[PDB]
Amino acid sequence: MTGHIDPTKEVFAQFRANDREGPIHMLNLVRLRPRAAYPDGRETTGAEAYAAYGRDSGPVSERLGGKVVWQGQFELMLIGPQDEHWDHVFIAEYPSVAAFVEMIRDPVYREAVKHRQAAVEDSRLIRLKPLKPGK
Amino acid sequence: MTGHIDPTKEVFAQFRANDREGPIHMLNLVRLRPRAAYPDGRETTGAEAYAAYGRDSGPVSERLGGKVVWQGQFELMLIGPQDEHWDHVFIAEYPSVAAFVEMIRDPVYREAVKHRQAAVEDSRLIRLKPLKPGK
Ligand SMILES: [Cl-]
Ligand SMILES: [Cl-]
């Protein structure tokens, strides 16, 4: 897959534009590459690289209010194409758009994400407003 | 569009094949038609048809242990293609694979789902095993 790894500048501007007060839930669908694509040639698995991203970004996220509020192990694409499969599926909550922006501006995060860039073959990051589960 | 609306028979077999004990979380991503595509030709919005699906399927789901455990309003595809957007995004929990199979076999559900078939332009239905949110 030549898939989607990073957000575009235009769409991130849209993210920041919609700054309504309230938590944001970030649904992540991540397909990891078998071999990590670092610029230096280093040879490691996508999983190992994604782990490093996690290890190094965790504290920044935690400090600014991020928390993983749901996580699941992928078992089956019951409706959808079979070429779609995800290795990590989770929802991260942040208490504000501003918290998320501060995370992605953090110098420590900006280094950690270099690992994500090397790790991810394809992904989705869907921004949602949480609802009371009654439609 | 030619999206994915229903599960294929082969993939549903795989779903039933994996009958490990424990709840299942079903992540639904649903894109609705502007105009519902029933056999009748009747004019209703996709939203109206999906409403009817929910209305008539709710009791069956409830009776067999189904519950919506998380639900969100789509705000932005931050990472991914901009043509991907979803009108309904939620996670339904069932206590077993069998509970879910009994739902989709229920004759009341089998009529309700006709509304889903009319409503949905494209969708994903991802089966997950819930994890304790620590990687
Ligand atoms: Cl996130
Ligand atoms: Cl479901």
What is the secondary structure of A10-35 as a DSSP string?
Answer: HHHHHHHH---SS-EEEEEEEEEPSB
Chain breaks in chain B (C to N over 2.5 A) after: none
B7 CB neighbours in chain A (<8 A) are 78-79
Report CB contact under 8 Å: A81, B4.
yes
* Sign of the dihedral through C-alpha B46, B49, B53, B54: positive
CB A106 within 8 A of CB A85: no
Say how far apart CA A124 and CA A126 lie, in whole Å. 6
Entry resolution in angstroms?
2.7
Residue among A68, A74, A127 minimizing CB distance to B126: A74
Q: What 3-state class would DSSP assign to A40? A: coil
Rounded distance between C-alpha atoms, residue A123 and residue A101, angstroms: 19
Alpha helices in A1-96 (DSSP H): 9-17, 46-63
**Buried b / exposed e along A38-68 (16+ C-beta atoms within 10 A):** eeeeeeeebeebbebbbebbeebbeebbbeb
Closest alpha carbon to A68 in A26, A11, A102, A98: A26
Helix (H) or strand (E) holding B34: none
B2-134 CATH pick, 3.30.70.100, 3.40.50.150, 3.40.50.10490, 3.40.190.290: 3.30.70.100
Helix, strand or coil for residue B106?
coil
Tokens read off for B73: 């309003």
For B48, phi and psi rounded to 5 degrees? -65, -40
Rounded Cα distance, B46 and A105, in Å:
40
User: Mutate which of B50, B79, B131 to disrupt the A interface (most A C-beta within 10 Å)?
Assistant: B79
Q: How far, CA to CA in Å, does A8 sit from each of A39, A41, A112? A: 20, 25, 19
Closest CA to A50 of A34, A65, A61: A34
B 65-124 residues inside an 8 A Cβ radius of A: 67-82, 84, 86, 89-91, 123-124
**What does the block give as tokens for B53?**
């699906």
CA distance B84 to B21: 34
A91 and B74 within 8 Å at the Cβ level: the answer is no
Report angle CA A46, A48, A54 to the nearest 5 degrees.
100
Q: How far is CA B33 from CA A69, B43, B46, B47, B123, in A?
A: 31, 12, 5, 8, 11
CB-based contact A133 B81, cutoff 8 Å: no
Query: Which of B72, B128, B130 is nearest residue A130 as measured by Cβ atoms?
Result: B72
Method: X-ray
Tell me the residue type at A126.
Answer: I
Min CA distance, B71 vs chain A (Å)?
Answer: 6
